Write a protein that binds this ligand. Sequence first.
Ligand SMILES: O=C(O)[C@@H](O)[C@H](O)[C@H](O)COP(=O)(O)O
Ligand SMILES: O=C(O)[C@@H](O)[C@H](O)[C@H](O)COP(=O)(O)O
Ligand SMILES: Cn1ncc(Br)c1N
Ligand SMILES: Cn1ncc(Br)c1N
Lengths: 551, 551
Amino acid sequence: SMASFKLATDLPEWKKLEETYKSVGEKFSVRDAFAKDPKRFEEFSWIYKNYDDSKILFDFSKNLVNKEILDQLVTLAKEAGVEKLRDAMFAGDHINTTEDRAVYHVALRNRALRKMPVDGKDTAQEVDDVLKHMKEFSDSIRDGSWTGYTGKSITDVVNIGIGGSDLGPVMVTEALKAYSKPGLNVHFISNIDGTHTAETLKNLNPETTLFLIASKTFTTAETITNATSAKNWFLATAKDSKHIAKHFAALSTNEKEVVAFGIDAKNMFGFESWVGGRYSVWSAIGLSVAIYIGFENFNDFLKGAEAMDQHFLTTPLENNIPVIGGLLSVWYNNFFGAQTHLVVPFDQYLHRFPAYLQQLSMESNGKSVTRANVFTNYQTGTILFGEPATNAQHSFFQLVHQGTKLIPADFILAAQSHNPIEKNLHQRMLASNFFAQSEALMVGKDEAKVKAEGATGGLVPHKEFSGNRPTTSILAQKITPATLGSLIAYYEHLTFTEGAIWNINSFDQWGVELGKVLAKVIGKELDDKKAVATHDASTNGLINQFKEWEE
Amino acid sequence: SMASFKLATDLPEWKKLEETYKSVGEKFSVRDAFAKDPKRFEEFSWIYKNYDDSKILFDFSKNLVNKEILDQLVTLAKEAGVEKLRDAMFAGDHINTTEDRAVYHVALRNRALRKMPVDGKDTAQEVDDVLKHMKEFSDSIRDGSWTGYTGKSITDVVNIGIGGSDLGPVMVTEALKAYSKPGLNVHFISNIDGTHTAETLKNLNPETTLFLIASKTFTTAETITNATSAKNWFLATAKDSKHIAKHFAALSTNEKEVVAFGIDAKNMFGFESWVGGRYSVWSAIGLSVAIYIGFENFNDFLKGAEAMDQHFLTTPLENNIPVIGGLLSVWYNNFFGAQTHLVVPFDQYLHRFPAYLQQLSMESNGKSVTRANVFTNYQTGTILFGEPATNAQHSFFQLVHQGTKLIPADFILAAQSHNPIEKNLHQRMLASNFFAQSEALMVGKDEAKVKAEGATGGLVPHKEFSGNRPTTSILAQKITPATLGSLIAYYEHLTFTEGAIWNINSFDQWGVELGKVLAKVIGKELDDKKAVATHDASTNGLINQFKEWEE
Ligand SMILES: O=C(O)[C@@H](O)[C@H](O)[C@H](O)COP(=O)(O)O
Ligand SMILES: O=C(O)[C@@H](O)[C@H](O)[C@H](O)COP(=O)(O)O
Ligand SMILES: Cn1ncc(Br)c1N
Ligand SMILES: Cn1ncc(Br)c1N
């Protein structure tokens, strides 16, 4: 399973891209590119067709890229063996080398029931069987047939989990909230901070609340603590532990720990080690989604991911949409030295989409060691950030337009709103902003125009805009379950691409693994009341100041 | 009002800091610094005492800084005239040069009624008079005496506004939600996206809902549109426009536009041009806060800001807490070339604190032109991001620990929880994470330790942690109104400092001003149905694809 090369900087096309950066890239004029190439929009935009014949336009043409540059980036991808690694992923090979695991989120959305084996054994029916369990259970919650311990239908579902066991369910239930039904609400406890439990459960009724304990390992400190506190809250009213079986289910890989916690095995929704947390919403972890919007919508979301998987698998690199996205990220990160990537949904439902992508991206690609087990001498993962528009335009877009940092940005809009109020007035205004913002980042406003518009003397430079600030625009028809499925999978495969070029393992997380063992030593120290002198002086000082100030 | 210098790079200490970066900074060992200096925690931490005798510890000692470096940064601040600009701000001078305005958020929290003049006229009583109006109105909402058009008490208050007229109210009501009362809820419509209106108003009763239309200009497109749609929603039930007077108030500078919209002048809460939006929560814009948690709590929040103002005004630079913070930001941005700054509250109530600071920071300091009206040839504002812990630890902290990017970070914890459930178990665990995370970023884990812990061969590098990754830890006793007031003001004055060194105008926003006129041309084009060919080919293509896909 070893690597075909050591460092990205070893790939012969890397030095050629450095040369191209110097001669064409650094000074690249997007205005000039459009003037030189009447077909530029056609050449640097791609329509994706989803399984339901809906469409998404990916327009890359406002980026600092042309045919020469993209052809060089494609050659780099071939040298890096992006296709070989991708094929190994889809083959169920153990490409997560450091944990010796398969990387098989693609198998979770295999609705076609293709043969998709791990360790030589097809996963298709095992995955499907969990999905059938999810459909049966979510249907029974939604139709009222699953009753709580006093015989009432469930009104509230509380997911308890953190990281990969939280953020997908949050983001996707928010994104697809138009598909929810009145009277059936979802909630998400994740932070160990007791505020999260107290505020979430404050107004809920134990008789009509169902908890889903979401944990791959079922040993995570925060989650098991939160789950215990919720069980205590439930039993304060319900009294008898026999009633737990109607109110607690588990989403997990670890049957022994689930049962040991006192959940019935029948109420476990399983998944496997080859599902990374930040790739897990497609699994049993998405049960809150199926409950909130219905299993059929959840299934449509999976099929959207599957269609984008097939696109990534089958398309030559030069027309492969997630690959192009990933190649542009490498271009900016490693040649321009842009440390960040901005993601801006022009969509209020997608308000937690940037935060989700931040996990996906940064937890996958924030690595310093390659598959050849040497340290990198070049940049890896970027820092991702964002908020929805139009809010963002009034905020940090000031810096995006007039600051000193290059910030590659992705803007996303649906042509149709789920909420086309006031005869679509609000939607037309939203869309006008989408178009005009990316236009303005490209066109800018030169000295002569500032003067024509009435500024004189020392005010003029203050009102200039450089332009040639790059954007990618992604236009969907509508943010349906299927569309969101395809969009997430796009970003998954974009992340894949970047990581393949950098020659890192996109699929481990030894810093978040360390995080889950770090705090125990200090926790024991906070339990007894003596002052501490066992760490560095800052840690000791902070701890001791805390001890003086704590309740 | 002109500048004493052109470019930061002209300041004699700038080149000296470049030299210090090369010889001491680049290779700085924080472990070595603690070993060399037994008093390092004491020397690089400061206790702030608030007006109510509560305290906040600011520990900078895990930063890449020592006495030599900090003394050089202080000298740079003196060369840049940070104190002169600060004194001009507090004097009511028109230091927002490009708009020729005073910068006088500090006057909003002048509870001491010091003489604080703009254009030679004291502002103290005018500010106070608005606050007395806010107290009377918020008291009458809270006590039930302000009734809606059918004679019922108000149960829901909806703020409508965007940017500076939204994010402060959102963040501060979230942060201080422990101080709210059952049955009186606040809501925030901001996005033009009609989803925001539809979802917010779905379950509200027009008879018991009060709107606050928050707009400095009272002409912002999104806000006036949202406000109109809310008025339409209200009148669909209420029928008669005479009932608007019991249900709509305005937070604004622009009395003529407010009345013209059909709000009663008596229900206007005014503020002045010298309040920037991203500095406005202290003004009439904070009315939702006063309603949600009570005017006395709002006033305590102002007094916390006032105390931090007095600290910033009166403290020599070497012990001036916001200045030190700002100097470290310049150090990382301009000498290390770190493009970002991470802010992580170990506090679920403060979940929107990073987003608020993102506006404050990036909208203030994302500028390319100095007070001498020349373009910069060095980096200005950083990109700010963050999410609360412990969630963030499971997410992008992977990259913070093991990626290739330097990411200066601020961690914030309260020693006491408003929600100390389970005999403070959750709070002790939260705090243990706070300490352990910053410890781990500093200490790292070398090759020998990885081997001792059981890794062999090619796995070892994958599990190494560099350490020497910097953090600032801020420990409060409790996040009270007063504490939050002081914390925001800290960041305001930190932002001030950075901008003063860069010699930019922290107080204009010509990119967000452009944003509010950009979209109108395209909006007219989306109104008629013909295809468009009036822009660049990408803009035209996106618009035309939208037209094919739109309802
Ligand atoms: O990305 C990850 O691996 C983490 O965010 C995990 O999802 C998080 O630690 C929760 O782990 P578990 O699902 O085992 O409870
Ligand atoms: O920071 C700013 O200036 C903007 O975010 C404004 O707050 C926003 O545009 C709203 O402007 P107004 O308060 O005039 O409606
Ligand atoms: C660079 N990038 N942008 C979004 C995502 Br997900 C990644 N990895
Ligand atoms: C650098 N920085 N960190 C927080 C804020 Br507010 C700013 N300007």
